[PDB]
Amino acid sequence: NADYYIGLDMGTSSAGWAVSDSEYNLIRRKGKDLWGVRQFEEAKTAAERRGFRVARRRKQRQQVRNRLLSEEFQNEITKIDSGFLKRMEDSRFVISDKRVPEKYTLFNDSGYTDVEYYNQYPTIYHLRKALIESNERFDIRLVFLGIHSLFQHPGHFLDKGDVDTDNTGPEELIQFLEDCMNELVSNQKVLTDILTDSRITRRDKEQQILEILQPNKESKKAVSQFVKVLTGQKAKLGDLIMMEDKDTEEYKYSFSFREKTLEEILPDIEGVIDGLALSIYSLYSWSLLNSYMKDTLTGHYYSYLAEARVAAYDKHHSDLVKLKTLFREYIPEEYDNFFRKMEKANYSHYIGSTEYDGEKRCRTAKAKQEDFYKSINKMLEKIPECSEKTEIQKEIIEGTFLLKQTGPQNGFVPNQLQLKELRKILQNASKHYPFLTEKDERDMTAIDRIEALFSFRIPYYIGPLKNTDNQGHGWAVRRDGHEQIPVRPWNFEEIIDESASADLFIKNLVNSCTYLRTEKVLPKSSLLYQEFEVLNELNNLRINGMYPDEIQPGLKRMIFEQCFYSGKKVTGKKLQLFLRSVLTNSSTEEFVLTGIDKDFKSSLSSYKKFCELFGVKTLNDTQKVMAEQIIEWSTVYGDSRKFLKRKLEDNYPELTDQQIRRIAGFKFSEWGNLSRAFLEMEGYKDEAGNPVTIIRALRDTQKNLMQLLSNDSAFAKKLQELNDYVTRDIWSIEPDDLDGMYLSAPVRRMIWQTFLILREVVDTIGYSPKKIFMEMQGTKAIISLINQCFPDSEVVYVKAGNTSDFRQRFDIPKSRDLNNYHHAVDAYLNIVVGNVYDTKSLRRMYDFNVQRGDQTAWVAENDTTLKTVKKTAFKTSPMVTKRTYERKGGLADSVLIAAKKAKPGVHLPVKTSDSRFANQVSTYGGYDNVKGSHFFLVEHQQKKKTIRSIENVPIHLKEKLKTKEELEHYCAQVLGMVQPDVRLTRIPMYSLLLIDGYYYYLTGRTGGNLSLSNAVELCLPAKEQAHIRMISKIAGGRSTDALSAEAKDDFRKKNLRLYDELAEKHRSTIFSKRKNPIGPKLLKYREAFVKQTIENQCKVILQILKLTSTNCKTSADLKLIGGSGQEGVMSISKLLRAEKYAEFYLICQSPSGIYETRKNLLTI
RNA sequence: UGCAAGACAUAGAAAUAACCUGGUUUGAGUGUCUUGUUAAUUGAAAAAUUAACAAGAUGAGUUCAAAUCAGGCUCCAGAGAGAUCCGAACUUACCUCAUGGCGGGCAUUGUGCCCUU
């Protein structure tokens, strides 16, 4: 019937809506003015969830790896000890709780117990040194524990190299790498020292090496490239081997050991180079692996990492004895408080172990290194300066004092070093135990499989192997006929189709076209797409204000043919040269180029590349399809060239090996933004009868993509026909529609709540809005939704500053600290400003009448409409509705608290299905801060009196507690309640509760009491709002220095009157009905309020205002006046009796606020 | 002037993976000497060791194991076995299951009021 507009202001925390007519007076239905504010907490990103998910998947893979290793050692372990694995698996439990009653986790056997196993080998790194540097037949358990530690500390997996390169020493390697060919030994110490010094970067190493080797003549560039290969940079072959025809591509290949390994670079250079593949040869790997394992004591690098961290252990012992000597003298008193007491940041805290006198070991959290160093420095202050004190302080500054072995600093260990250690362990133990040599069906050897499990890391493209379709996060495509069989190393290629899995990964990631939303996009390097870019750029190119083909027909074709076939970057000067060459006429050649930025940003690189690939000049259709598929495979597979090589060999047999090598050397990286079908869509028939396409239209005519998609173009009609438009029902937008467009979670919640308000308003009103005014990233998402549900409505974008200019110029103050109405006033102002600006200096636009056609927007005469907006601007009508949500999050803290601190019931046990951790939280610790999801109202009997209680449902029990019977059972057993009768099964967090005539927001729980926040917005006149704005500005960092004495007096008096108004609002108005009012405390504390200075007065005013706001916990820091920082807190007992409470209502509010149900908790 | 489609450059982020260092809890790495009290086996008694306490003194210390959201999935019962992936993100007013209802209306400075169920 009538015509109405809806205005919308979205914020990450609040969403405000308003509805108006052409006269800017609000539509009101159900007797309620249709404008309000919906608040919701800022949504949380999936970063923490993703981190925890990858962490738990990593843990699961570690578990299966350890189980496999245990199964491989099980036969010999059981031969020597029946239950070693069970003792390993029952390490947490006390002696009684173990499956078998024993005392210590490892080496239970009599004689060789744990107490002297740790005496023989103080650490694991003492055992591994013994394993790799000895031949004596070791117990299978010792080898198992060494390999177990190696598995539990794998290493970087970031470097490329070979383990065996460390067997040959630096001297022998230098001898083998000194003048290998006919085109160093003396300086075999400084070079190695520079190479193995991690302090200097690669560039510094290269500069020092070039400075110190003093290269011979005629090899300066060759020696520079050799140094680049040595330290590791992208260096071409070039003069390394010195062929004359350097211009050839085979001798211009660039390779760096950082980007690729030797076995991967070799195929790219096999056959091309002379000799037995030759120039650094397996000496950079030695430098990388031996850089970390230096000693700086004898100058000789350690062979294996276990040889280090034993010398570090000895250095720790020497430093500890030095500090003990330095402490026993000069400080006989703080000996007990530092080396035995479990105080803060001392040695016992640095380790987490102490034994004062006979008492049990006190194991606590390990103190950080920084705190321990600070404590050592503080306790060294009492010691007068001496040699030992200076040396200790120098070591502390150097950071190599009292070092531990396992810590945050162990991130430098490469997997190759640990692999070498494992290989040595397995070779030493292989000469005695024969089970480590026996073969398998797949020709394994019981040693190669352990190494495989050590080294097999699932590639990033494969992702998780199994998916039960509970949620879509796996791509691993399994071979036909291969299912329900576990994925391990040595059968990854036989179970997961790696090529198909990578293809699925890339096509799932890649996005759809910007014009055809159902078909996927072409690779950027694809011939069609590159030709599209070049043709577009030629179309935009204009010469002296004329079209490129307007100068003479065939100019654009000539440029596309004879200027781009080279495939290189076409610059402006090259185009000028071509224009001079091809144009016989036009002697003057000062042709000004417009439409390009002096360089053609696109070039037919792929066309030329495939032209040299096939030798022919111009490709045909079959060769074009061949090249298109080759480019698609190279782009999808990317850095993994093995997939491309396999596809080429199994699909295109006519290609030669040199051609395959050339294909593998191409650089096809990124994806485009236009689909394949969009470029070849059949816009119309031509005169000859052949089809025309968008790409062919660019080729022939003089137009770009946007011109080809004009309103009258046949391509536009074909686009509308192909992109079928369905006006989906307003009531069919599930919140998964906005899950495709790449939006952050806060924006997603913004969009969903705002659209819910829109849907409720439109349904209630009856018909779609004529205009929907909205602010100017994620807002565009709702645009789509509007265009998917309300085709008639047109969105009138409003500038961000226009509304604020209206507020300042026409005197409508906004009070961001007072109440939440400013969102609704912002939406209504969006309506009134956007309507005027859509109808039409910037201020002058509001100085006269604005009217277009039959619709009148602004009437300056008598300010009639203006009066209306002002009468609406200050109205306290808006509805404030907080989102009622179940508190989704964690079950409890992710880190277990100590047993001596945990208490039963309040703390979640470690594992509530074992009957061991559940009833023994005081012994095995537990999880703290067990959060709850939602509240429920249950009627029970206490002291033979019928009373009702609101109680919590914890998050870890939400799924099993959503019906009346289940909640009754939960109250009956877990909460120890007699005769429960659950009356309300869902009271979400942040819900409107009417208690004793005052509105509350149920926002948590503190033990036996439930916590509430203020739900009544406080309204004050305009002058008070301006004063509060000044208060907020001054309390933010401004000063009173510029203010005059009269200004100070006026500020003091107006502050006093604002305080009086606030005090009265807490006494005579609704705020007096709150539980534990602050009015008496406001009046009692008023005496000291005047004596306070201006700035602290502003602070206490803002803190007082914090009591009457719905966006913060009701608490004030009135310490500047004399009260505590928790003044005016609201919390009421969870027991609802019939005496203390007059009306205990729950106001279930619809998201728009139009619909609401009041449930009487007392008598439901 | 806004919107948004194409190309380049400069700064970024986020979503999925893969991995590392770990961190937390628990448990293991026998603590040892003197003094006295208490309780034991003796012993008229003396004395005697043993064991738990309350003081004083002294030695060692670097590591390992298990989990690492509660849980969930499958199989035939349980302080199990399989799998190594689902679980900390987005969505949830209320009523009884439809593109339903959540009454007809007046205010909006203190949570009300008229007219019918």
Added chain:
DNA sequence: CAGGTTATTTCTATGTCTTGCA
């Protein structure tokens, strides 16, 4: 419950050369 690394894709600001709509 914190600090790092690797890969892919997408998105966002700003500037540059164009083009079309409301």
